[PDB]
Curated annotation (Swiss-Prot), chains A, B, C, D, E, F:
The gene is FTL. Its main location: cytoplasm. It comes from Equus caballus. Keywords: Acetylation, Cytoplasm, Cytoplasmic vesicle, Iron, Iron storage, Lysosome, Metal-binding. GO terms for biological process: intracellular iron ion homeostasis; iron ion transport. Stores iron in a soluble, non-toxic, readily available form. Important for iron homeostasis. Iron is taken up in the ferrous form and deposited as ferric hydroxides after oxidation. Also plays a role in delivery of iron to cells. Mediates iron uptake in capsule cells of the developing kidney. Delivery to lysosomes by the cargo receptor NCOA4 for autophagic degradation and release or iron. This is Ferritin light chain.
Length: 174, 174, 174, 174, 174, 174
């Protein structure tokens, strides 16, 4: 079949298609998180913007994987995309906890694919993940952890005040 | 009589004059709200500015209706303007609640005039309201709802602190 | 009560609130005059613009009085606003005569408040009126008088011609 | 037949073709009006320019309808274009009266097509007319009405003087 | 419940959520179409770019609907997203035929929601669709129809040549 | 009658009015040709643009004749405008053949009027045609002939391919 494919296992090809589904799932989760914080009865603009930006980031990660799949001569295969785990996301703290859980699941999927690529002696795949995904994920998880700590310190006995202040003074808004 | 009037019912003409009175009433309400928050014993500059801007907006809406009345060949008729419902407006929360009530009453008057225009097969009137009023009102009511949520979250057990913080960190001031 | 109020009589405070009502009444009168001259069966654009500008000027005068009321520690109190004296304003000459009458009534109210301020030994009030109102009114009444003379000279036996020419060659239009 | 046509009735398609004929008729009427006022024995340059501009406007309206007909998958069908109603157009007043009559006939045709579109549940057609035709027509009829009033006021007992003055001081010329 | 919701039916709210699912489905379909034409054994860059741009457009339409849902005080509810109808999309002609079918299904959903909004006397919804969706869809379907005609004329007896030429000389590429 | 007319025969005056009708007929023919090539089932943008430009050119020629008629003191007289000869224009080749036929008929009318002007010893008319019409027509007919030759060479056994290529590589498009 493929005129270009070289050193690209069927196992890696399938795992890349699965990883695309995971990233598009994550993008959809962030879309939902974003619009929840835009509700008039929630109304935390900086929180909305934070998650909308992540929805775009995860979309872009999926696109990069798809580009790479074609560069290697694999075939993109798309599956249904499950809806996010919740319809309502609670407080900023609840939301940021759910986001860290989601990011750790993406990071583990990256690490798992690196293990497979390594076992298949596929250095192009391994360096692709190293160069465009692993550090991006470490940096984002650090950021989220920083945010969680600041959110947690602001709860005190005045949760509403703290949630407002975090949105106003840490998160980016107009 | 009119050399230009075409497809413009007497019912619509009268309802437009009434709507002008409603908008000028609303402008006057906002003038009063604005100067209340400028009192030395109230002194919330961002709140003052918010309502003064709305007084100008409602004035402008009345002017647009009057322009349209002449464009269609109707006759502007002005009636007395009642004073606002209160002389003192309480807290920012009280004020923002009164403002949302006022805006919903203007929105219902717009919707009622759209019903009449539709029934009179007056598409110029219907598109005039759609193009220059309905979405402006939806956007403003959303904004006010967002504000109400943030005000409410800041009350906690420290109402003065929360009222200060909202004025400082959400509303526009010098 | 007031933490800032000093040398500010209740009599002056009330008279300022009344003067605000007079200026907003005058603004409303000019709004009506303006839209009358915008009628397709009247259609004197320069006349329309002249009165619309005065509606804005009178609004601004009311706002300045309200600002001053708060600066002195008085309390703004708003009353109903009566509608203008006429629904239709006749010729440019009729309109300019009504405007001069209106301006002389505002000027007399200014002068009356100056008398009260003087009697109450309130030099801040007296200089406020001198600096921001008295000369503005003298200048406007002179302008209107100039206009009345030119309108009157153009009536001749050809009233329509003269009314057109005055609008075209004295008043500001596009 | 058509690969793109959706929700586009034969009735609307035919009425659009008729409306194109009406607009091109109107354009031709304005061409004739324009060149009449360019005659050396008429010689009212501002009047000539006014009508030549309207000939272009009506041409453009016909072109927009034709574009829309193709966008919806209808078929443009052209019919003969009748010549204007007069060869000589009388005074500026006669001409402006004929123009208002013409514009009211175009406005009624627009309104009639809106009724048909509404009855056919064709919201694209209805919004097309609302967005690009109805307000343009209301604005033009208001302008013409304004002009008629000023022309009429200038007739007096000196018709030639008034006709000159209107052309010089209201209408655009070099 | 909602502090802002006014004249916004539960029926419209649900239909908007369904329409979001339809637009995100369409975006996913275009993502798949785009990456198919990027395959080394397909390799039609202009075709790839055409569909990738549409994936972004449909995403943006879904985002606009979600924004509007919150502006009106409805609640966004997300459902699973089905995968596209095909894994391989055939020729440019096959692909463009599938795209027109997809667009006509989105257009019918828009028209159906307009019918519901009209029946619910919801003019804000109706004008929202008119202003941001209906004409965009008519323009896109016209474009696709134009493309289909040119593709079809190029098939002749030399399908590969024609498919190359269309991609090179009609579609945008680097 | 005319204060300016000199050396301008009634025969020339009438022939100029007829020539205006011919040019406006030709403009209408080109309008129809243009919109035919804009049909979604025809879709040859460069061909559409070619004929739309000619519709404008022929309109302008009619306007120049009308200007000249007034400059000489003749009287413009407009007649009904017949619709174009066809509703559907076939292939680019069919269309370009019809256009050359049309242009040769305009050229012969120009030449015929030059004969009349010459016989009437009307050098202003003769030079007017020489300076603004005769060479423009020769240049356009040469262009059309060039186009016909290239269209004809591209028919071969692959008519659709050739028609596409001509539109793409000879005619001006976006
Ligand atoms: Cl699920
Ligand atoms: Cl009252
Ligand atoms: Cl009264
Ligand atoms: Cl006729
Ligand atoms: Cl499925
Ligand atoms: Cl015929």
């Amino acid at each position: 079949s493929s005129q270009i494919r070289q050193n690209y296992s069927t196992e890696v090809e399938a795992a890349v298609n699965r990883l695309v589904n995971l990233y598009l799932r994550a993008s959809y989760t962030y879309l939902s998180l974003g619009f929840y914080f835009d509700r008039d009865d929630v109304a935390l603009e900086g929180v909305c913007h934070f998650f909308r930006e992540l929805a775009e980031e995860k979309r872009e990660g999926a696109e990069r994987l798809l580009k790479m799949q074609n560069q290697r001569g694999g075939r993109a295969l798309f599956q249904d995309l499950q809806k996010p785990s919740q319809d309502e996301w609670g407080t900023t703290l609840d939301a940021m906890k759910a986001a860290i859980v989601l990011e750790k699941s993406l990071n583990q999927a990256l690490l798992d694919l690196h293990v497979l690529g390594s076992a298949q002696a596929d250095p192009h795949l391994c360096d692709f993940l190293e160069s465009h995904f692993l550090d991006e994920e470490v940096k984002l998880i650090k950021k989220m952890g920083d945010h969680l700590t600041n959110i947690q310190r602001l709860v005190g006995s005045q949760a509403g005040l703290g949630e407002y202040l975090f949105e106003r003074l840490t998160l980016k808004h107009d």
